[PDB]
C-alpha cells in the first residue's frame, strides 16, 4: 500500500510520511483548524516539505553528523513541557493521538536534525556588517538590534538556501 | 575553425526607419580599446568630449563638429626596447574640470580638462577597470583586484579602501559605484551589492543579489558589474546570471527581484527600467515590481552595449558597428544604423542632447535622432 | 556485419553460436554484444557472458576479455562454470604476456614486463587450487610451469644485466630471489653461475664456494 | 591490430620441466617461500589444442 | 662514461665501529641498517658490502661479514676495509 | 498483520534472494505500516531501485519494484572538440558504462563533471545534457549531447605592481600567452589553470632570481568577458626591494659532513639574492648527502630577511635522513621494451643505497629515451623493513615508430625534401633503425641507419649506416660533376662526459664521378690517381672504392639546443682512408660555436663560430676534389653564394656535351674556347678556414612578450678556402688558389625564429671583401625542416 | 616544415 511519492538524491519520500503530515496533521495534530486551503491545493506544498526535509537529512548525513539520544531526550522534554503535559503522560496521550512512539520519535529526530543542519549552514553565510547594528540601535541597542538583524537576514537567507538546495538536489516525482 | 557558438548570433533585424539617424561627426582616437573588454568610453562636460584608447591617448574633442581640442598620450615611451601602453580601461569621467581615467596599470589619471596635463596620477590597489565615479570630493574606483578605493579629487591620494570579496573566476569589468546621500552603492564580483560610506568607507550594508550560484562550476558567475541606480530611495542592481533586484538604499533589503542578469548598465527613468540582458535581449520592466513591460529579442546574442535614452528612444550598439533605436513604449525598432566596422562594446553616452559612442577601433561618433 | 537485426534472443544467440563455430570472432562478438546489451541479466545471459569472454579472448580483445571475466566473477562468484572463467582469466593474462608489437618472432620476450605473467600465474594457481579436478587444471598446470619458467627467465635477465653492469650485490640478490621463488626453473640453474661470479667479484669467496657446491650438486 | 594473435595457439607445452635443485651436504638452499609453487594436481582435461576452451554448455 | 656503480650497504666506518660481538641482529640492523646480502645457504651471516666503482676511478669495496649464531647474536665480525 | 511471502514483481537484475535479504525482514514476522515503510527505505537505500511500491494484495506484501535501468548504450553528439574515447573514460570515472545501471541521480553530476572538464579546457560556454531514451526490458540509452561553444582564449595577461620589470618582459616567460603571432611559434592563448599556477611560479622565480626576496603575489584574478570568449589574467604582485644575500648559515643533521656543506654554502661578499642559486645550493647539499648514502636528504632554506640593511640570511636547515637501500628496481609497462633497455637508463643501482637524485635521474633518462608517453616512479617500502625500498618505474610505452616528411627551402639547397621512417625501439630492443632520405637542389641522399645505442653496457653505441648519395655539383654552384656514391659506415660512439662524445668508425664509400667538367683541379686529382683522361669528352667517368677510418669528437656544452646563449659546441670530425682504398687521403674538420653571454638575462650573446678543415693525400695521391671544403652561403660565410668562396674552376678547352651558342657552356671549345680559361664557379679546396663573430642582440622592434622567440644577430664572417695543391709555378697567369690570405669577409644581419613553416633563418650580408670570381648573394635565407 | 607522425 505504501507507495513511493518521490525520490530525493539517495533517499526517498514514501507515502506514509506524506500522508502523516496530511491526515494526522492539517486539520489534526494541534489546533486542528490550522490551514484550510484544501488537501489537493496543498498537496504540492506538503510534498515539497517532505522533499526538502529529506534533502536536509541527506545534507546532515554527508557531514557525518550524528545526534546523541541525550539531545533527543532533552528535545522531547521541551516538546512535552511546551504542551503543558508531562513526558510519560504525553506519550500516553500520543498513543491515542495516532502518532505512535516509533513515528513520533522518528519525526522529532528528523525535525531536530534538519533544524541543526539549517542553522549551521545558514548562520555562517549571514554576514552582519558592523554598521547596520548601530543603524538599527539608533533607529529604535547593545546587541539587541543584532537579534533583529539576524532575524531578517535569516528569514531571507533561509528561503535562499532552500531554493539553492532544492536546485542542487536530485528530486524526482514518482507519483 | 571547428569552434562554433552554443548560441547563434541573431541576424541583423530589418526595420522601417521612422527617422534617419546619422553620424553628426566622427573623430578617431588611436586604435581604441580594440578587442579588449574595457569600460573606456567618451565623456562630455560642457561642449567637449573626452575620449581615450587603451594605448594611452586621450583626446578632448569639440562636441559640435568633433574637432580635437587637445590630445595627450599617457603612455610613457621607454627607450627603444619596451613600449608601455597606459592600458586605459576606466571609462573617462569628468566632474571638476578633471578627466579621470583608470588604467590596467593600476593607475588613475586626473588630467586637467583645460589642456590635458596630468593634474594627478595615483597608483591604486589593482586595475582601475570601472568608471572613476566622482562624488563628495572623492573619485571612487572599483579595481579588478576587488577594492573599492576612494581617492581625493584634488590630491589624488587614496582616501580609503574597502576590500570586496573577489571570486576565483569573475567577469571582466567592475561595477562603477553610484552615490546616494553620502553613500556609495557598488556591485561586487561576488554578487553582493555593498553600500559604503563616502567619508570612512565602512559598509552600510552588503546584500547578495545573485542567488544564482550553481556551484561546482566556476561559471556560477554572479558579477554585479552594472553600476547600481539609486532612484527614490531604491537601489536597482543587476547581477550576472543573477537577479535584477530593487533593494532598499537605507537597509539593503530586497524590495523585489527578477530572474534576469546583465553586466551592462541599465536606465531607470521615471517608472521604467530598460536593460539589456547578458544574452543581449532588450527588456523594459516596471520600476515597482520588475514586471516586464516589453521585451525585444531581435538582437539576441549580438553582444549589445549598454542602452541609453537618446530623445526618448533606447539606443544600443552591437559588436558589428550597428546602432539600434528601440522604442521605449513597446520595444519596436524605431531605427537602425551602421556606424562602424570594428563594432561597439563600451556604453553610449547620451548627454546635453549629444549621443556619442566610441567604437572598438577608437572612433568616437556623434549621432543625431 | 555490424548492425545486428532485431531478431529474438534465441535467433541472436543461434547466430552467435554459428559464428563462433564458424571461427569468425568479430561477428560472433557483435552478435553476443547485441544479445548482452539488448537482454542484460535476462534469459541465459550467463552463457552469453561466457561466450563473450571466449570470443574476446579468441579475437584478442584481451582488455575486453579481462573486463568481462572480472565482471562475471564479481557478479557470479559461485558459478558451476567459474573454473572455466578463472582459466580464461589466466589465459587472458598469458596472452597479454606474449603480446608482440609487430612480430612474435623468436624474441621469446622473457625479459619484458612480467606482470601479466604474474597475473596469469596467480589465476592459474587459484584455478588449480580451488578446482583441482577441472578439465582446465592440467592445462592450467602446464601453463603454470611455463609461467614460472618465464618469470624465472625475467629474473635471470635482470641478474644477467646486473652482471653486465657490475652490480654484484644486485646480481646476488636477484639470484637469491630466484633460488627462493623459482628454485626449480632452468633459469635459476642458469643464474647460479651469475651468483657465483657476483660473489667472486665481491671477493666473497666463502659464498662463491657455496654457490659452486650448489652448481656441482646440480650438474 | 595483430598484436596478441599468436596467443590463440600460444606454442607452449615445451616449457622445461621443473627440477628441484639438490642442496649439497653441509648447506641448505634458501627456503622456497612457495609463492610460485605449482600444486601437484591432474585435472579431467587435456592440454594444448586438446582442451576446448569454448565455454561449457549451460 | 659509466655512472657510479654503488653496491650494498653504506658503511660509514663509524656505524661499523658501533657494532661489537654480542649485539643481536636487531641492534646490528639498527646500527648499520638491513644488509643487502645475507647468507641464503648457511647460518645467519650478514654481508655488508660497501662497494663503490666511480666514473673510471677504481673499484673500492669494504666487506663487513657479521656471522651471528642460532639466536641471532653477533659472534664473529670480519671487516675487510679494502678489496684485495 | 503477519507476513508470510514477499513478491518482487519487476525484478530482473537483483536476484530475488538478494532483494529479499537486502530488506531487514524475515518471513514469519509481524509487519505494521512502520515496518513496511522501513523496508521500503532500506531496499531503496540499497541503490538498485528507482521505484518501490509495496502492495498488500491478500495477505502477502506484493513488493512492486521499478529497477534501475541498464545503460544500453552511451552516445555522444556535438562533442566535436573531444573524441568519444576520453568522454567514455571520464564516464568510467563515475562508473557509467554500457551494461551498468543508470541511477538517474549521478547523471546530473556526470554532465556537470563534463562541463567542468570543458571549463578547464576553456569552453566556458560548454553545455552538456544527458538525455535518456527508454528501451524495452527496462533499458535506457544515454545520449550525452554537447554544445561546446567557442573555447575562451587569453586576451590579456596583466601584472600590477611590477615597476622593476615591464609586464611584457615578465609575461614572455609564461606558458600562457595573450598574443600568439602568426609568424612566430610562441604557444596558444588557451587558458589552463595548471598553466596559470606554473606561470605564477615562473613569476616568483623571475623576481626571486633578481633579489626580490620580499616579492609576493598578492592575488591573481581570472576574469571572463561577458561572452566568455576572452580570459584576462591579472597578477597583482608586490615586488619588494632587491635584497643582498649576506650569508648562508647551515644547521641540522649534517651527518658529519658540515665541512663540505659549508664549502657548498659559499657566496660572494653581499651578492644579490637569487632564488635559483639558493635552490641550486640546496640541490648541491642534497647531492652531497646522497653521495654519502642518504636517500631523502631534506634541505629547507628559510630566508631571514632584514629590511633595514636589505639583506637576506639563508638559514639552511639540513636533515640528512635515514639510508634506504633499493632491494630491486622494477619496471611496469615495459611490455614492448625489454627490461635491460629501461634498466640501462637507471643511474640508481639495485642492491645499492637509494638516492632520490639517482632515481629521478633514471626517470628523466627513461623519459629521454622517447619510448614512453609517461614514466612515473614509486619508491615503495619493502614490507617489514625500515630501510629497504623497491623503485618501481611505471612506464607507458609509446609507438616508437615514426615516419616524417619535411619540406624546407633555402638559398643554399633550393627546395629540400626530407623523408624518413624510423623505429627508435626496434622490437623493444633499443636498436634505433630507420631509412631516411633527403633531396636538395644538388644532392639526393638515402640513408638506412641501425644503431644499437648500448653496444657496451657503459653506453658505447654501435651504428651501421647504408647510404646512397647522388650529388650533382653544378646544382651546388660548383663546377659540373655528378658523384653517385654509396656505402657503409659502422661507428662506435663512445660517451665520455655527457658533453664530450668520441666516435670511431669504419666506412666504405664507392664513388662514381660522371660528367666531370674538364678542369685543372679535377684532372690534377685524377692524374694523381693514376688515370690520365683527355681534357675533351666532358662525359668522363671514374670509380673509386674507399675504406676510411672516420673519427669524431663532439663537445656539446650548449645550455639551450635552440637559441643557445652560453656554452660551446666543438665537433672535430676526421676521415683517413685506410690502406687498401683507391683514394689515399686524410681530411680533418673542426666545427666550433662558442656562445658567450655578455649580460645577465643572456639576451646579449657573442657567438664565436669557426669552421676549420684540412685534407690532403697521404703521398703521391691527392684528396678527391669531391671531398673538398666549401665556403659561402648561410652556413659558413653569409652574403656569399653557396660554395662560391675558394678556388675557382680552371677549365680546359673541350667540346660541350650539349652545344647551343650564346651559353658559354662552362667555357667549351665548341662555344669558341681555345686555351685554358678562368671561371666564376667554385671547386672547393682541400683547406678551409671560416670564422664568424656574431653579436646576438635582443630583437629591437618587437614585443618583449616574444622578443626572445626571435634571435637577432649582427655577424662578421671571415672565410678562406684554398687548394694547397694548386700549381702556383705552373699556373702563373691565374690567381694563386693555394693562398689562405684570400680571406673573404662579409658583415650582415641575421634573424632566426621558429616559424610555423619551420625554423626560419634569414640574413642580409654585404661582402665587403670578396675576390675575383666570388659570386655574392646578399640575402640568404633558410626555411628549414 | 617537418612533419612527424608516429606509427
Ligand atoms: Mg566583474
Automatic annotation (TrEMBL), chain A:
PROSITE patterns: PPIC_PPIASE_1, PPIC_PPIASE_2. It is found in: Periplasm. SUPFAM superfamilies: FKBP-like, Triger factor/SurA peptide-binding domain-like. The PPIase activity resides only in the second parvulin domain. The N-terminal region and the C-terminal tail are necessary and sufficient for the chaperone activity of SurA. The PPIase activity is dispensable for SurA to function as a chaperone. The N-terminal region and the C-terminal tail are also required for porin recognition. Chaperone involved in the correct folding and assembly of outer membrane proteins. Recognizes specific patterns of aromatic residues and the orientation of their side chains, which are found more frequently in integral outer membrane proteins. May act in both early periplasmic and late outer membrane-associated steps of protein maturation. This is Chaperone SurA. It comes from Escherichia coli.
Automatic annotation (TrEMBL), chain F:
Coiled coil: none annotated. Its main location: membrane. PROSITE patterns: POTRA. The keyword Repeat applies. Keywords: Cell outer membrane, Membrane, Repeat, Signal, Transmembrane, Transmembrane beta strand. One of its GO terms (cellular component) is Bam protein complex. It is found in: Cell outer membrane; Membrane. Part of the Bam complex, which is composed of the outer membrane protein BamA, and four lipoproteins BamB, BamC, BamD and BamE. Belongs to the BamA family. This is Outer membrane protein assembly factor BamA. The gene is bamA.
Amino acid at each position: 500500500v505504501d507507495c513511493v511519492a518521490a525520490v530525493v538524491n539517495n533517499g526517498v519520500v514514501l507515502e506514509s510520511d506524506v500522508d502523516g503530515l496530511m491526515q494526522s496533521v492539517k486539520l489534526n495534530a494541534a489546533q486542528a483548524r490550522q490551514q484550510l486551503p484544501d488537501d489537493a491545493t496543498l498537496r504540492h506544498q506538503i510534498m515539497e516539505r517532505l522533499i526538502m526535509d529529506q534533502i536536509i537529512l541527506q545534507m546532515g548525513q554527508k557531514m557525518g553528523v550524528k545526534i546523541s539520544d541525550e539531545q533527543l531526550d532533552q528535545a522531547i522534554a521541551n516538546i512535552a513541557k511546551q504542551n503543558n503535559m508531562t513526558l510519560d503522560q504525553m506519550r500516553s496521550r500520543l498513543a491515542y493521538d495516532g502518532l505512535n512512539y516509533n513515528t513520533y520519535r522518528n519525526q522529532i529526530r528528523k525535525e531536530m536534525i534538519i533544524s541543526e543542519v539549517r542553522n549551521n549552514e545558514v548562520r555562517r553565510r549571514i554576514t552582519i556588517l558592523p554598521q547596520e547594528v548601530e543603524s538599527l540601535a539608533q533607529q529604535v541597542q547593545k546587541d539587541r538590534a543584532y537579534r533583529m538583524l539576524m532575524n531578517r537576514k535569516f528569514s531571507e537567507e533561509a528561503a535562499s538556501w532552500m531554493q539553492e538546495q532544492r536546485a542542487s538536489a536530485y528530486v524526482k516525482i514518482l507519483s | 575553425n571547428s569552434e562554433e557558438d552554443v548560441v547563434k548570433m541573431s541576424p541583423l533585424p530589418t526595420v522601417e526607419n521612422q527617422f534617419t539617424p546619422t553620424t553628426a561627426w566622427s573623430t578617431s582616437v588611436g586604435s581604441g580599446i580594440g578587442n579588449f573588454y574595457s569600460n573606456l568610453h567618451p565623456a562630455l562636460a560642457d561642449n567637449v568630449v573626452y575620449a581615450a584608447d587603451r594605448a594611452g591617448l586621450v583626446k578632448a574633442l569639440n562636441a559640435d563638429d568633433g574637432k580635437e581640442i587637445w590630445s595627450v598620450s599617457l603612455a610613457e615611451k621607454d627607450g627603444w626596447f619596451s613600449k608601455e601602453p597606459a592600458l586605459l580601461s576606466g571609462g573617462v569621467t569628468v566632474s571638476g574640470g578633471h578627466v579621470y581615467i583608470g588604467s590596467e596599470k593600476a593607475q588613475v589619471y586626473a588630467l586637467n580638462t583645460s589642456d590635458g596635463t596630468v593634474a594627478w596620477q595615483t597608483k591604486v590597489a589593482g586595475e582601475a577597470l570601472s568608471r572613476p565615479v566622482v562624488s563628495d570630493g572623492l573619485v571612487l574606483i572599483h579595481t579588478s583586484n576587488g577594492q573599492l578605493q576612494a581617492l581625493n579629487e584634488a590630491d589624488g591620494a587614496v582616501k580609503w579602501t574597502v576590500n570586496l570579496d573577489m571570486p576565483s573566476l569573475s567577469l571582466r569589468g567592475e561595477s562603477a559605484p553610484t552615490t546616494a546621500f553620502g553613500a556609495a552603492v557598488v556591485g561586487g564580483d561576488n554578487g553582493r551589492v555593498s553600500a559604503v560610506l563616502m567619508e570612512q568607507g565602512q559598509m552600510i550594508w552588503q546584500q547578495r543579489i545573485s542567488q544564482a550560484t550553481g556551484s561546482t562550476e566556476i561559471d556560477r558567475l554572479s558579477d554585479v558589474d552594472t553600476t547600481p541606480v539609486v532612484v527614490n530611495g531604491v537601489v536597482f542592481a543587476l547581477a550576472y546570471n543573477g537577479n535584477l533586484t530593487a533593494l532598499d538604499l537605507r537597509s539593503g533589503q530586497i524590495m523585489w527581484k527578477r530572474e534576469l542578469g546583465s553586466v551592462n548598465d541599465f536606465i531607470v527613468d521615471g517608472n521604467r527600467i530598460y536593460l539589456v540582458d547578458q544574452n543581449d535581449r532588450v527588456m523594459a520592466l516596471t520600476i515597482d515590481g520588475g514586471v516586464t513591460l516589453w521585451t525585444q529579442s531581435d538582437l539576441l546574442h549580438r553582444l549589445l552595449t549598454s542602452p541609453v535614452l537618446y530623445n526618448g528612444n533606447l539606443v544600443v550598439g552591437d559588436s558589428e558597428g550597428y546602432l539600434h533605436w528601440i522604442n521605449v513604449e513597446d520595444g519596436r525598432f524605431v531605427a537602425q544604423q551602421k556606424v562602424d566596422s570594428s563594432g561597439f562594446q563600451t556604453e553610449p553616452v547620451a548627454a546635453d542632447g549629444k549621443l556619442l559612442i566610441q567604437a572598438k577601433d577608437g572612433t568616437v561618433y556623434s549621432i543625431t535622432r | 556485419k555490424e548492425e545486428v537485426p532485431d531478431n529474438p534472443p534465441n535467433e541472436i544467440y543461434a547466430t552467435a553460436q554459428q559464428k563462433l563455430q564458424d571461427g569468425n570472432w568479430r561477428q560472433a562478438i557483435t552478435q553476443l554484444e547485441a544479445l548482452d546489451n539488448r537482454y542484460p541479466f535476462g534469459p541465459y545471459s550467463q552463457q552469453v557472458q561466457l561466450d563473450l569472454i571466449y570470443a574476446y579472448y579468441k579475437n584478442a580483445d584481451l582488455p575486453l576479455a579481462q573486463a568481462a571475466i572480472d565482471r562475471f566473477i564479481r557478479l557470479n562468484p559461485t558459478h558451476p562454470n567459474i573454473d572455466y572463467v578463472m582459466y580464461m582469466r589466466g589465459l587472458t593474462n598469458m596472452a597479454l604476456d606474449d603480446s608482440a608489437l609487430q612480430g612474435f618472432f623468436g624474441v621469446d620476450r622473457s625479459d619484458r614486463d612480467p606482470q601479466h605473467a604474474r597475473a596469469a600465474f596467480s589465476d592459474f594457481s587459484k584455478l588449480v587450487r580451488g578446482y583441482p579436478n577441472s578439465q582446465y587444471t592440467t592445462d592450467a598446470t602446464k601453463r603454470l610451469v611455463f609461467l614460472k619458467d618465464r618469470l624465472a627467465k625475467y629474473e635471470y635477465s635482470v641478474a644477467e644485466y646486473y652482471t653486465e653492469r657490475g652490480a654484484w650485490v644486485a646480481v646476488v640478490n636477484r639470484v637469491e630471489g630466484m633460488l627462493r621463488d623459482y628454485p626449480d626453473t632452468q633459469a635459476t640453474r642458469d643464474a647460479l653461475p651469475l651468483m657465483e661470479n657476483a660473489y667472486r667479484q665481491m671477493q666473497m669467496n666463502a659464498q662463491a664456494e657455496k654457490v659452486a657446491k650448489i652448481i656441482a650438486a646440480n650438474s | 591490430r595483430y598484436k596478441r594473435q599468436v596467443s590463440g595457439d600460444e606454442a607452449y607445452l615445451e616449457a622445461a620441466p621443473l627440477a628441484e635443485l639438490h642442496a649439497p651436504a653441509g648447506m641448505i638452499l634458501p627456503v622456497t617461500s612457495g609463492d610460485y609453487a605449482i600444486p601437484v594436481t591432474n585435472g579431467s582435461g587435456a592440454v594444448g589444442k586438446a582442451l576446448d576452451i569454448r565455454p561449457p554448455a549451460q | 662514461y659509466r655512472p657510479d656503480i654503488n653496491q650494498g650497504n653504506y658503511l660509514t666506518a663509524n656505524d661499523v665501529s658501533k657494532i661489537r660481538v654480542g649485539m643481536t641482529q636487531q641492534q646490528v640492523a639498527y646500527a648499520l641498517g638491513t644488509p643487502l646480502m645475507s647468507d641464503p645457504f648457511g647460518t645467519n651471516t650478514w654481508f655488508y658490502v660497501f662497494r663503490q666503482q666511480p666514473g673510471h676511478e677504481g673499484v673500492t669495496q669494504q666487506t663487513l661479514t657479521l656471522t651471528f649464531n642460532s639466536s641471532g647474536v653477533l659472534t664473529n665480525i670480519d671487516n675487510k676495509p679494502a678489496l684485495s | 498483520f503477519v507476513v508470510k511471502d514477499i513478491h518482487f514483481e519487476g525484478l530482473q537484475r537483483v536476484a530475488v534472494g538478494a532483494a529479499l535479504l537486502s530488506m531487514p525482514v524475515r518471513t514469519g514476522d509481524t509487519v505494521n505500516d512502520e515496518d513496511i515503510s522501513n523496508t521500503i527505505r532500506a531496499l531503496f537505500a540499497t541503490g538498485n531501485f528507482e521505484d518501490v511500491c509495496v502492495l498488500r494484495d491478500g495477505d502477502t506484501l506484493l513488493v512492486q519494484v521499478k529497477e534501475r535501468p541498464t545503460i544500453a548504450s552511451i552516445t555522444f553528439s556535438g562533442n566535436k572538440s573531444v573524441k568519444d574515447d576520453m568522454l567514455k573514460q571520464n564516464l568510467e570515472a563515475s562508473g557509467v558504462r554500457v551494461g551498468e545501471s543508470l541511477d538517474r541521480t549521478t547523471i546530473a553530476d556526470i554532465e556537470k563533471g563534463l562541463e567542468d572538464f570543458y571549463y578547464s579546457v576553456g569552453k566556458y560556454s560548454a553545455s552538456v545534457k544527458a538525455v535518456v531514451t527508454p528501451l524495452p526490458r527496462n533499458r535506457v540509452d544515454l545520449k550525452l549531447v554537447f554544445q561546446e561553444g567557442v573555447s575562451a582564449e587569453i586576451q590579456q595577461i596583466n601584472i600590477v605592481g611590477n615597476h622593476a620589470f615591464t609586464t611584457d618582459e615578465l609575461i614572455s616567460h609564461f606558458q600562457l600567452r595573450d598574443e600568439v603571432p602568426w609568424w612566430n611559434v610562441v604557444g596558444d592563448r588557451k587558458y589552463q589553470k595548471q598553466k596559470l599556477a606554473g606561470d605564477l611560479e615562473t613569476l616568483r622565480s623571475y623576481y626571486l632570481d633578481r633579489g626580490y626576496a620580499r616579492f609576493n603575489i598578492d592575488s591573481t584574478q581570472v576574469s571572463l568577458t561577458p561572452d566568455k570568449k576572452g580570459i584576462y589574467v591579472t597578477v597583482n604582485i608586490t615586488e619588494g626591494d632587491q635584497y643582498k644575500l649576506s650569508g648562508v648559515e647551515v644547521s641540522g643533521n649534517l651527518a658529519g659532513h658540515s665541512a663540505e656543506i659549508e664549502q657548498l654554502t659559499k657566496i660572494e661578499p653581499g651578492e644579490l639574492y637569487n632564488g635559483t642559486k639558493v635552490t641550486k645550493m640546496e640541490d648541491d647539499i642534497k647531492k652531497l648527502l646522497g653521495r654519502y648514502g642518504y636517500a631523502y636528504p631534506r634541505v629547507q632554506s628559510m630566508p631571514e630577511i632584514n629590511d633595514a640593511d636589505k639583506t637576506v640570511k639563508l638559514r639552511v636547515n639540513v636533515d640528512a635522513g635515514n639510508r634506504f637501500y633499493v632491494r630491486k628496481i622494477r619496471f611496469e609497462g615495459n611490455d614492448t621494451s625489454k627490461d635491460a633497455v629501461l634498466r640501462r637508463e637507471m643511474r640508481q643501482m639495485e642492491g645499492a643505497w637509494l638516492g632520490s637524485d639517482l632515481v629521478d635521474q633514471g626517470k628523466e633518462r627513461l623519459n629521454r629515451l622517447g619510448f614512453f608517453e609517461t614514466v612515473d616512479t614509486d619508491t615503495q617500502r619493502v614490507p617489514g623493513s625500515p630501510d629497504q625500498v623497491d623503485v618501481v618505474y611505471k612506464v607507458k610505452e609509446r609507438n616508437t615508430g615514426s615516419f616524417n616528411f619535411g619540406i624546407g627551402y633555402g638559398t643554399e639547397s633550393g627546395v629540400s625534401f626530407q623523408a624518413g621512417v624510423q623505429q627508435d625501439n626496434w622490437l623493444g630492443t633499443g636498436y634505433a633503425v630507420g631509412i631516411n632520405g633527403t633531396k636538395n637542389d644538388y644532392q639526393t641522399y638515402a640513408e638506412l641507419s641501425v644503431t644499437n645505442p648500448y653496444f657496451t653496457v657503459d653506453g658505447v653505441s654501435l651504428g651501421g649506416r647504408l647510404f646512397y648519395n647522388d650529388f650533382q655539383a653544378d646544382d651546388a654552384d660548383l663546377s659540373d660533376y655528378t658523384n653517385k656514391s654509396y656505402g657503409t659506415d659502422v661507428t662506435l660512439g663512445f660517451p665520455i662526459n655527457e658533453y664530450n662524445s668520441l666516435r670511431a668508425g669504419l666506412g666504405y664509400v664507392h664513388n662514381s664521378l660522371s660528367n666531370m667538367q674538364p678542369q685543372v683541379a679535377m684532372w690534377r686529382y685524377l692524374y694523381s690517381m693514376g688515370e690520365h683522361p683527355s681534357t675533351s669528352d666532358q662525359d668522363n667517368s671514374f670509380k673509386t672504392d674507399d675504406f676510411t677510418f672516420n673519427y669524431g669528437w663532439t663537445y656539446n656544452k650548449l645550455d639551450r639546443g635552440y637559441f643557445p646563449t652560453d656554452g660551446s659546441r666543438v665537433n672535430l670530425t676526421g676521415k683517413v682512408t685506410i690502406p687498401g682504398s683507391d683514394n689515399e687521403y686524410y681530411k680533418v674538420t673542426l666545427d666550433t660555436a662558442t656562445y658567450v653571454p655578455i649580460d645577465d638575462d643572456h639576451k646579449w650573446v657573442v657567438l664565436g663560430r669557426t669552421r676549420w678543415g684540412y685534407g690532403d693525400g697521404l703521398g703521391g695521391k691527392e684528396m678527391p676534389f669531391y671531398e673538398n671544403f666549401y665556403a659561402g652561403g648561410s652556413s659558413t660565410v653569409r652574403g656569399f653564394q653557396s660554395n662560391t668562396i675558394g678556388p675557382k674552376a680552371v677549365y680546359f678547352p673541350h667540346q660541350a656535351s650539349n652545344y647551343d651558342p650564346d651559353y658559354d657552356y662552362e667555357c667549351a671549345t665548341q662555344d669558341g674556347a681555345k686555351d685554358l680559361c678562368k671561371s666564376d664557379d667554385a671547386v672547393g679546396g682541400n683547406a678551409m678556414a671560416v670564422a664568424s663573430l656574431e653579436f646576438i642582440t635582443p630583437t629591437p622592434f618587437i614585443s618583449d612578450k616574444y622578443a626572445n622567440s626571435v634571435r637577432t644577430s649582427f655577424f662578421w664572417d671571415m672565410g678562406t678556402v684554398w687548394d694547397t695543391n694548386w700549381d702556383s709555378s705552373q699556373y702563373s697567369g691565374y690567381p694563386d688558389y693555394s693562398d689562405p690570405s684570400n680571406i673573404r669577409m662579409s658583415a650582415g644581419i641575421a634573424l632566426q625564429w621558429m616559424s610555423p613553416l619551420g625554423p626560419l633563418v634569414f640574413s642580409y650580408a654585404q661582402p665587403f671583401k670578396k675576390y675575383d670570381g666570388d659570386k655574392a648573394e646578399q640575402f640568404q635565407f633558410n626555411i628549414g625542416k | 616544415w617537418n612533419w612527424t607522425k608516429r606509427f
